[PDB]
Amino acid sequence: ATVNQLVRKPRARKVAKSNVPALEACPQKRGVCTRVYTTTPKKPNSALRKVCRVRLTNGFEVTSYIGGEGHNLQEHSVILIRGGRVKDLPGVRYHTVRGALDCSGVKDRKQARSKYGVKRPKA
Template sequence: DVPALQNCPQRRGVCTRVYTTTPKKPNSALRKVCRVRLTNGFEVSSYIGGEGHNLQEHSGYVIRGGRVKDLPGVRYHTVRGALDSSGV
């Protein structure tokens, strides 16, 4: 369920914060996550997949649906290779 996309396949937004967070038990890691303010006014958490990233505050993002099962509240993925994010 991805309400912030409003029936669109992707949405564009601007990053407000990049941080790492730890997953639920029994997993252990530092997952890369960013907070994104979308063009439709929503502000959501989005997972940054892949090894290494160049994403920082005030850079443009495209997010897609797709939750991360071991991170509560993270229901979106960033699209790598679009706008300011480099490809993997």
């Protein structure tokens, strides 16, 4: 704080590391989804949350949430993980992109349709 003390040793704010080690800080990665689960949340909430566990293309084995009502994932099903924490489940840090490699769009959906991988219904 004294200016001599800063000449001797300057200020230094820490690095504030990343929530998502999707390495290189890439927007999506792809993985193999080693298994598929349902997992109970933390205390104020209760549900069964549909969550896969994925061997990414960079080596990391990370678990990942599966959005929307109902999926078609089973154990090999190469998916595109996204980045984004589900706070209610302890330790999922990622999401799966619905409407991507082996992850179909959400069936019978009409609103917020782009974020669930669903094409525009012809009418």
